[PDB]
Write a structure and sequence with these properties.
carbohydrate metabolism, EC 3.2.1.8, binds a molecule of 2 linked components (XYP-XYP), binds zinc ion, hydrolase, 13 helices, Endo-1,4-beta-xylanase A, polysaccharide degradation
């Protein structure tokens, strides 16, 4: 009957999926991508290695394709991601330390300016913290210092005043040292007048291990005055799939969706792609997989039933 996007929209939220250029040829895949979801995230081609492969020379070719596709289906789009220590072109490491801040600002200005007025959110900075809450020692942190995050948000706001600016990270779904650090940063930013409109909880979860404090965590961020979004939701399991594992995964998906629906400022959910066929999990987590609502043959799993039921 109604799609996840339609059910989500009926509750003032969006339900979308990330995608990547190489997948678009898959006709069965795109038909579902374009009809089931109300939002799309550019999976890879908005990343630094693609948009600015050589210093000062920008390339939005691949990203534009996905943005146009989303627009064609009437789907909103999330930009991902401007500042990240991963998938960074090699020339960035060679930039003299004293020049890096200026380079990061430039990268941000161009990309945000080019897509201005077409995206709903921008993941401005991604994974800037370690598990214990200390700063990840990336090229930006090391050469620019602690203010690089704040500078990144300022630059972004200066290039597009209407788009929502998000801080994105993983393992910040439950209350803990990592989410506390993000919590403090957001508090710090609000007090200093540093622009930031939301926190993106990637939500790359493990079946049977969903943080029970998820909802309370979403709520405290919302009380700080920022929106919250589950940006790259997937719940992996150790293969092979079994009925019991699928059922546990379904229960998990339902609890995650319910948590968002209970908090007024949880604007939406995005799954890191929607079919196991293209999930990034197997490639990064050896022995793990089957983390999405649709399996490799596009059959909806019990997980799908739970998501729809939670959305109502
Ligand atoms: O490169 C990053 C991955 O390393 C990250 O995977 C997290 C590692 O710790 C595990 O406990 C989490 O479940 C897993 O998601 O995901 C984000 C990616 O950018
Ligand atoms: O194809 C893979 C992408 O799907 C993957 O996306 C990363 C997953 O972890 C998140 O924290 C990152 O923000 C997101 O970009 O990156 C690797 C690429 O090979
Ligand atoms: Zn090109
Ligand atoms: Zn275009
Ligand atoms: Zn704490
Ligand atoms: Zn199947
Ligand atoms: Zn069903």
């Amino acid at each position: 009957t109604a799609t996840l996007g339609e059910l989500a929209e009926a509750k003032g939220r969006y339900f979308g999926s990330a995608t990547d250029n190489p997948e678009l040829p898959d006709t069965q895949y795109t038909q579902i991508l374009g009809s089931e979801f109300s939002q799309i995230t550019v999976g890879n081609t908005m990343k630094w290695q693609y948009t600015e492969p050589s210093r000062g020379r920008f390339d939005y070719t691949a990203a534009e394709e996905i943005v146009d596709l989303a627009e064609s289906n009437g789907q909103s789009v999330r930009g991902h991601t401007l500042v990240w220590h991963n998938q960074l072109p090699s020339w960035v490491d060679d930039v003299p330390a004293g020049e890096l801040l200026g380079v990061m600002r430039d990268h941000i200005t161009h990309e945000v300016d080019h897509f201005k007025g077409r995206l709903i959110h921008w993941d401005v900075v991604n994974e800037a913290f370690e598990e214990d809450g200390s700063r990840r020692q990336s090229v930006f942190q090391q050469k620019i210092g602690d203010s690089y995050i704040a500078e990144a948000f300022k630059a972004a706001r200066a290039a597009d005043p209407d788009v929502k600016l998000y801080y994105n990270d993983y393992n910040i779904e439950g209350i803990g040292p990592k989410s506390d650090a993000v919590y403090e940063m957001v508090k710090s930013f609000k007090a200093q007048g540093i622009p930031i409109d939301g926190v993106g909880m990637q939500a790359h979860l493990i079946a049977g291990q969903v943080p029970a404090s998820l909802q309370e965590n979403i709520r405290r961020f919302a009380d700080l005055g920022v929106d919250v979004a589950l940006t790259e939701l997937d719940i992996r399991m150790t293969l092979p799939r079994t009925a019991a594992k699928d059922a546990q995964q379904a229960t998990d998906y339902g609890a995650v969706v319910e948590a968002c629906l209970v908090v007024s400022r949880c604007v939406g959910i995005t799954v890191w792609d929607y079919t196991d066929k293209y999930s990034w999990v197997p490639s990064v987590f050896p022995g793990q997989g089957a983390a999405l609502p649709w399996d490799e043959d596009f059959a909806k799993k019990p997980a799908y039933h739970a998501i729809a039921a939670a959305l109502n």
